[PDB]
Amino acid sequence: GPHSLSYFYTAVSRPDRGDSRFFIVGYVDDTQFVRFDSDAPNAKMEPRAQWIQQEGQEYWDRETQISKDNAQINRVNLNTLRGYYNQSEAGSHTLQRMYGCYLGPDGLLLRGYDQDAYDGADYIALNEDLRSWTAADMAAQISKRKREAADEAERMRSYLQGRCVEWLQKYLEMGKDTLQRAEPPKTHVTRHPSSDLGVTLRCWALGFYPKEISLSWQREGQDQSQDMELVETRPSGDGTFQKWAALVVPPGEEQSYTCHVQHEGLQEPLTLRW
Amino acid sequence: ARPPKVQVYSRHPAENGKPNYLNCYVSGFHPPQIEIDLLKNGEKMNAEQSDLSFSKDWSFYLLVHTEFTPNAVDQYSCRVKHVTLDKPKIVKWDRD
Amino acid sequence: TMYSLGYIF
Numbered sequence: 001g002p003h004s005l006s007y008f009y010t011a012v013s014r015p016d017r018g019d020s021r022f023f024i025v026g027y028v029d030d031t032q033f034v035r036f037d038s039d040a041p042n043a044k045m046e047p048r049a050q051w052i053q054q055e056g057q058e059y060w061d062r063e064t065q066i067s068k069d070n071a072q073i074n075r076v077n078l079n080t081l082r083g084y085y086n087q088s089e090a091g092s093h094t095l096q097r098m099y100g101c102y103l104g105p106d107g108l109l110l111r112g113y114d115q116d117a118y119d120g121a122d123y124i125a126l127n128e129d130l131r132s133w134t135a136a137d138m139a140a141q142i143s144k145r146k147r148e149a150a151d152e153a154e155r156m157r158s159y160l161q162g163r164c165v166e167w168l169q170k171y172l173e174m175g176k177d178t179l180q181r182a183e184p185p186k187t188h189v190t191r192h193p194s195s196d197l198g199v200t201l202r203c204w205a206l207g208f209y210p211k212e213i214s215l216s217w218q219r220e221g222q223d224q225s226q227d228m229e230l231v232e233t234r235p236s237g238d239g240t241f242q243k244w245a246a247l248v249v250p251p252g253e254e255q256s257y258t259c260h261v262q263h264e265g266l267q268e269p270l271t272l273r274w
Numbered sequence: 275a276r277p278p279k280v281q282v283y284s285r286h287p288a289e290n291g292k293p294n295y296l297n298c299y300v301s302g303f304h305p306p307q308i309e310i311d312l313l314k315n316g317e318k319m320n321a322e323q324s325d326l327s328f329s330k331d332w333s334f335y336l337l338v339h340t341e342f343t344p345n346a347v348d349q350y351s352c353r354v355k356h357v358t359l360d361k362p363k364i365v366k367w368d369r370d
Numbered sequence: 371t372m373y374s375l376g377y378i379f
Contacts, residue, residue, distance in 0.1 A: 012307075025325050027327075032325065094306055120276065120304040120305070204287075206287075232279065234281050236286075237285055237295055
């Protein structure tokens with residue numbers, strides 16, 4: 001799939017203290033490369049990838065500044081929205097934003113995006129053409145009118161089309177060894193026989209870099225996905241992922257089943273049996 | 275309001291007496307306030323927690339992890355407290 | 371690098 005640079009903002013109101021807490025994480029594809037946390041003492045934007053550590057104080061001074069400004073503005077956004085919903089000061093609330101650019105095949109923007117959510121409900125999205133907003137309710141209509149009066153949809157469109165893509169291309173270069181190399185899954189089958197219930201065959205894939213993978217089980221030249229248990233792809237915590245698929249088969253039939261693995265880091269689709 | 279799904283697993287396949295990493299992957303939850311305990315033999319361990327991030331559906335995920343050396347006696351598990359759960363979710367760890 | 375311009379609620 002095409003490369004992506006994405007930023008994820010979370011604000012939480014803290015009414016015990018009458019203040020807020022603010023997080024950002026930056027991603028290129030499935031690699032976190034920066035964070036910020038407004039509760040950190042002398043809070044700054046910190047690298048979370050080796051290949052970004054090299055950036056000078058000039059880079060960190062700008063991101064840290066944006067982060068602090070956003071921590072301040074996002075405090076009052078939470079107050080604003082609480083007013084729009086005529087809500088108590090009792091409760092905690094969350095305001096999320098995400099935005100980013102995909103890198104098209106002719107080195108231009110392919111699909112830029114930008115969206116917000118109050119208490120996990122869609123509030124506003126920038127439209128596909130990036131020249132207009134869609135608002136989910138009466139409160140969101142207030143925010144949308146202000147953004148329209150401020151011509152902010154063209155500011156986002158210029159950013160997504162300009163800086164976002166450009167810095168995606170720079171990051172992809174800086175981290176090409178990790179970011180552009182596909183690690184194929186290390187795979188095996190495990191067998192767990194039971195009292196009197198059938199044998200469980202588990203097909204493991206571990207240490208693959210791009211998150212996207214397909215596991216399936218087949219018997220004699222027919223798919224079996226129908227009754228197979230498939231866990232959600234999970235981080236290994238070293239930047240790779242893992243996944244397994246399991247099914248129960250009659251005692252003695254274990255070699256009648258093959259696991260099929262599809263991942264973009266393999267030369268050919270792969271076939272496993274216990 | 276959305277409940278977390280919880281997965282508990284090692285980074286590499288477990289060999290006894292071999293240094294490894296114990297993961298508790300907690301996902302799909304809203305709101306973000308959550309308690310995630312890696313327990314050894316019932317007692318909380320000092321487990322490092324990943325930065326708060328979220329998926330395209332707005333749901334939050336976190337990876338809690340810590341070094342560990344598997345063996346035949348230690349029982350490990352992951353405990354999760356969330357407003358969406360009436361009593362804590364515990365998932366036992368088991369080379370699966 | 372991040373967006374630095376207005377995002378009004």
